[PDB]
Amino acid sequence: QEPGSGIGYPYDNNTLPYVAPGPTDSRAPCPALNALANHGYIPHDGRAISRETLQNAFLNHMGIANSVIELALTNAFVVCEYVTGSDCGDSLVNLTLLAEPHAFEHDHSFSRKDYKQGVANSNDFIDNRNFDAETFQTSLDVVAGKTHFDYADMNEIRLQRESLSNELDFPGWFTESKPIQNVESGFIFALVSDFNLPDNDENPLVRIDWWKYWFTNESFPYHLGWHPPSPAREIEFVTSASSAVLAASVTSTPSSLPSGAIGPGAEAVPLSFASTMTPFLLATNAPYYAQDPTLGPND
Ligand code: HEM
Ligand SMILES: *[C@@H]1O[C@H](CO)[C@@H](O[C@@H]2O[C@H](CO)[C@@H](O)[C@H](O)[C@H]2NC(C)=O)[C@H](O)[C@H]1NC(C)=O
Ligand SMILES: *[C@@H]1O[C@H](CO)[C@@H](O[C@@H]2O[C@H](CO)[C@@H](O)[C@H](O)[C@H]2NC(C)=O)[C@H](O)[C@H]1NC(C)=O
Ligand SMILES: *[C@H]1O[C@H](CO)[C@@H](O)[C@H](O)[C@@H]1O[C@H]1O[C@H](CO)[C@@H](O)[C@H](O)[C@@H]1O
Ligand SMILES: *[C@@H]1O[C@H](CO)[C@@H](O)[C@H](O)[C@H]1NC(C)=O
Ligand SMILES: *[C@H]1O[C@H](CO)[C@@H](O)[C@H](O)[C@@H]1O
Ligand SMILES: *[C@H]1O[C@H](CO)[C@@H](O)[C@H](O)[C@@H]1O
Ligand SMILES: *[C@H]1O[C@H](CO)[C@@H](O)[C@H](O)[C@@H]1O
Ligand SMILES: *[C@H]1O[C@H](CO)[C@@H](O)[C@H](O)[C@@H]1O
Ligand SMILES: *[C@H]1O[C@H](CO)[C@@H](O)[C@H](O)[C@@H]1O
Ligand SMILES: *[C@H]1O[C@H](CO)[C@@H](O)[C@H](O)[C@@H]1O
Ligand SMILES: *[C@H]1O[C@H](CO)[C@@H](O)[C@H](O)[C@@H]1O
Ligand SMILES: *[C@H]1O[C@H](CO)[C@@H](O)[C@H](O)[C@@H]1O
Ligand SMILES: *[C@H]1O[C@H](CO)[C@@H](O)[C@H](O)[C@@H]1O
Ligand SMILES: *[C@H]1O[C@H](CO)[C@@H](O)[C@H](O)[C@@H]1O
Ligand SMILES: *[C@H]1O[C@H](CO)[C@@H](O)[C@H](O)[C@@H]1O
Ligand SMILES: [C-]#N
Ligand SMILES: [Br-]
Ligand SMILES: [Br-]
Ligand SMILES: [Mn+2]
Numbered sequence: 001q002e003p004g005s006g007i008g009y010p011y012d013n014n015t016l017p018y019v020a021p022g023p024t025d026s027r028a029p030c031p032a033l034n035a036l037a038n039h040g041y042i043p044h045d046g047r048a049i050s051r052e053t054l055q056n057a058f059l060n061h062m063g064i065a066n067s068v069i070e071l072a073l074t075n076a077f078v079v080c081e082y083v084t085g086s087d088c089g090d091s092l093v094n095l096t097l098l099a100e101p102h103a104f105e106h107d108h109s110f111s112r113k114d115y116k117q118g119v120a121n122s123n124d125f126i127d128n129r130n131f132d133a134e135t136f137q138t139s140l141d142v143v144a145g146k147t148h149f150d151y152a153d154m155n156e157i158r159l160q161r162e163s164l165s166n167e168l169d170f171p172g173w174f175t176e177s178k179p180i181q182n183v184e185s186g187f188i189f190a191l192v193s194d195f196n197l198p199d200n201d202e203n204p205l206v207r208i209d210w211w212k213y214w215f216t217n218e219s220f221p222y223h224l225g226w227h228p229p230s231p232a233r234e235i236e237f238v239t240s241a242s243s244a245v246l247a248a249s250v251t252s253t254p255s256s257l258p259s260g261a262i263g264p265g266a267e268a269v270p271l272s273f274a275s276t277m278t279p280f281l282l283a284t285n286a287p288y289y290a291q292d293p294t295l296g297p298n299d
Pocket of ligand 1: 029030031032033054058064068069072073076098099104105106107108109110111112184185187188190191
């Protein structure tokens with residue numbers, strides 16, 4: 001928000017306004033990075049981004065501690081070298097390359113289509129990077145008519161997304177990604193669980209309106225009473241939530257689930273790519289911005 005607005009106070013005392021991305025700006029498949037970039041907490045153009053710039057932006061503007069993004073930083077830079085063909089040092093070339101498929105970006109996302117979702121021909125691909133309202137609605141509708149949801153509900157959401165993606169993706173494309181997805185499950189509990197409930201730290205429940213605002217708008221739901229978690233969330237909370245989602249009892253089983261979908265997931269680890277392997281072409285679509293309605297500087 002505009003610095004003088006005090007909308008962030010006393011949790012964030014140095015805010016900057018929302019500015020929609022223009023056609024030449026680089027955006028990510030990540031709703032967190034996109035929100036940060038839209039506020040200029042990382043470069044508005046989404047290019048040439050250092051580890052410290054990312055650390056500071058998450059910590060000071062989102063209540064996300066350095067521990068939370070340690071692996072994510074490692075993996076961003078692995079993907080940068082893989083896509084560009086050379087070491088990216090400490091300047092992430094852009095946000096867009098993070099949408100390189102079957103890498104950090106993965107299938108059965110909550111709010112993005114898959115790289116080969118519903119393509120008629122094997123060589124074709126689609127926008128697996130920009131926010132997709134229809135896809136996100138498939139996640140939201142698992143919890144239709146509710147204001148909050150728990151770990152068991154999140155397990156049901158990711159299962160619905162896995163089922164839909166396994167059915168709709170070009171045959172042979174679909175690749176299950178429980179470890180990366182469920183760290184992201186943890187990230188959702190970390191950012192938008194309801195801190196106004198007395199047991200939030202131990203038994204977090206996601207506030208659906210906050211989740212929807214964040215993903216749809218790629219900005220922060222201050223108008224709905226949200227603020228950055230204080231103190232900043234740490235990695236332990238995230239991986240615990242990840243475990244809990246995958247351990248939760250499944251009461252409604254979708255068909256067309258991949259083998260081993262139900263049950264615990266592997267620890268997320270650093271990515272690696274064969275030097276021989278050429279990267280998949282990146283979707284070239286202009287960056288998405290909210291248009292129904294468009295956002296003002298304080299939104
Ligand atoms: C340097 C730090 C980060 C990097 C490089 C990064 C990168 C990515 C990438 C490449 C994806 C796409 C995965 C996919 O859904 O196919 C993604 C998704 C996602 N990110 Fe991040 N991320 C970072 C930090 C965070 C943080 C701190 C949060 C929240 C606290 C967050 C929230 C999410 C969520 C919820 C998704 C899933 C979106 C969906 O499934 O529709 N990210 N991120
Ligand atoms: C995306 O953000 C816009 C702008 O903040 C939301 O529309 C506003 O919602 C606030 C409460 O958050 C209301 O006080 C205003 O009346 C709304 N303003 C406008 C211009 O409509 C919108 O609801 C957000 N979208 C989602 C899905 O959360
Ligand atoms: C983000 O960076 C990537 C990697 O450099 C860009 O993708 C490459 O763009 C060049 C043209 O400039 C092509 O020759 C390559 O084929 C692209 N690589 C892949 C794997 O697709 C991408 O255009 C950049 N995006 C933005 C918006 O800046
Ligand atoms: C991205 O751009 C490529 C060349 O610029 C196209 O060949 C791709 O199909 C893809 O096009 C999509 O996004 C661009 C924005 O760069 C639009 O101009 C296209 O109409 C399309 O939506
Ligand atoms: C914001 O400023 C107030 C008043 O000086 C201070 O009490 C508070 O600790 C500040 N918040 C942060 C996150 O530094
Ligand atoms: C989230 O984190 C837990 C604990 O490391 C994993 O079991 C899960 O697969 C996901 O990565
Ligand atoms: C989540 O899982 C990690 C290991 O993946 C633990 O280190 C952490 O304490 C939490 O249980
Ligand atoms: C790990 O931590 C999370 C968040 O505190 C809990 O919800 C979970 O039960 C486990 O203790
Ligand atoms: C979350 O909890 C599960 C079950 O204990 C672990 O296997 C995982 O490593 C993480 O600590
Ligand atoms: C069984 O219970 C789970 C959560 O406890 C729901 O998500 C599911 O829809 C079913 O009613
Ligand atoms: C749906 O069915 C699966 C097995 O097919 C169970 O694991 C789940 O608990 C639910 O009953
Ligand atoms: C219970 O919920 C699951 C997951 O959302 C559905 O796939 C199933 O049809 C049932 O309604
Ligand atoms: C499709 O298959 C699943 C089990 O794999 C069932 O739970 C569902 O009811 C449907 O028959
Ligand atoms: C990480 O691992 C891959 C194999 O999965 C290697 O190709 C790469 O060079 C690095 O050792
Ligand atoms: C990278 O490009 C090579 C050709 O150099 C393809 O064979 C490969 O599958 C990938 O798209
Ligand atoms: C986004 O842009 C629209 C024009 O389409 C304005 O009406 C709105 O206030 C927001 O700035
Ligand atoms: C973000 N993962
Ligand atoms: Br489709
Ligand atoms: Br797994
Ligand atoms: Mn994806």
